[PDB]
Symmetry: C2
Subunit: 245 residues, 2 copies
């Protein structure tokens, strides 16, 4: 019942001209109706992307803050994001957490505010390499998920993105079994801590060096409901990933 | 030194309210001897530039230190220029004190922004503890040094002094006290850069300024303008623009 979900995280890449070419490629591709496509452009280009992108494709912000307006130079709010015609926001991405130091608490507050303002949330979790090697992947993602869940009143507008940090921008894609393993546990966590209904209906997507050459096998895993795609979302093969079935 | 008035909208406004504010600014007779810059929320840089008359420049409220990269939620100087903005605000007290941006990182942002061809509003200022410890000079000179370590051409640079120690602290911050700091800052530029740079570099006041007080502040010989906060969202901003008239 879970609709296949493919997110394109352009990160801090591109200009109007090159991004326009990506958009032109997506519009011409005529995406299939049974996958939910979302593009997350650089914050300066949220409005631009929405204007050029086919309506059947949604636009996401790459980050936001936790109030509607305020004295926070350099930030944007969910209100501004919706005002630009976007309907999603990516929160908790490993780069926000581990380069810019966003705490779990802050991320939880952002999740609560974004949902309160009627914005969809792509909520990211994932363990570091040293956590994976120490055998505590499960403990880490469970705790990250707990903070998110405690700030979600409605899961219909939430998608969970498991991105192991050692796979993000490293070329080291998680194997199907590695991803399936974690997605299985996370769905089990939802069932035990939230509800069976939430467990069955919530999309849990994988991210981390997802490519056209790895998507098919990852997508076939029963608990992998789609992808969050960084590097490859800037390339023609993103279309192939959308069509991973 | 051409009088410089910057309006930092911070995280405020939507297309409707900002469109109305912009309408006022376009209709305003901006004096020819005053350089006016507006800094909208990042999502609205493109929107603001499209609507604003060329007589008013647009600034980003922040940026990152590389031209493209895996930095979800960030934007580069190239994107800022690509949207038609010609300035960026860096080192604002809120970036430093709420989001923990270090001097080192700030310096690296300045270096890249300038090389990309943007003007930089470089913000400095000491906190209350630093003020009451009697190390105002030590702190602001160090902040200024880090900026200076990353500036070859001072032509596109504007120093903004923020009396952070005066924000919500109950401490008096008089026009005389603003002059006292600005005089020392120019003294630093003269010794550590050149006579010409000291004479030509705008040093603007980033403390509390209103229509009723802007003229007394602007009459200080070493105060070359303002970085305006909340009043920048109101028609009162025009009165501040007109401070020299
Ligand atoms: Br990603
Ligand atoms: K599947
Ligand atoms: K003056
Ligand atoms: Na004109």
């Amino acid at each position: 019942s879970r609709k296949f979900f493919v997110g394109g995280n352009w990160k801090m890449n591109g200009r109007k001209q090159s991004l326009g070419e990506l958009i032109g490629t997506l519009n011409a591709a005529k995406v299939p109706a049974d996958t939910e496509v979302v593009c997350a452009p650089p914050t300066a280009y949220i409005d631009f992307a929405r204007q050029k992108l086919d309506p059947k494709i949604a636009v996401a912000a790459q980050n936001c803050y936790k109030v509607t307006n305020g004295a926070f130079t350099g930030e944007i709010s969910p209100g501004m994001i919706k005002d630009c015609g976007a309907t999603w926001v990516v929160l908790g991405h490993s780069e926000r957490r581990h380069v810019f130091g966003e705490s779990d608490e802050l991320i939880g507050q952002k999740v609560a505010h974004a949902l309160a303002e009627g914005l969809g949330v792509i909520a990211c979790i994932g363990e570091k390499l040293d956590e994976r090697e120490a055998g505590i992947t499960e403990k880490v993602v469970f705790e990250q998920t707990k903070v998110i869940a405690d700030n979600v009143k409605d899961w219909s507008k939430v998608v969970l993105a498991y991105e192991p940090v050692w796979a993000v921008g490293t070329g080291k894609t998680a194997t199907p079994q590695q991803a399936q393993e974690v997605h299985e546990k996370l769905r089990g966590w939802l069932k035990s801590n939230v509800s069976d209904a939430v467990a069955q209906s919530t999309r849990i997507i994988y991210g981390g060096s997802v490519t056209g050459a790895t998507c098919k096998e990852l997508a076939s895993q029963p608990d992998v409901d789609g992808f969050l795609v960084g590097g490859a979302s800037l390339k023609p093969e993103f279309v192939d990933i959308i069509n991973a079935k």
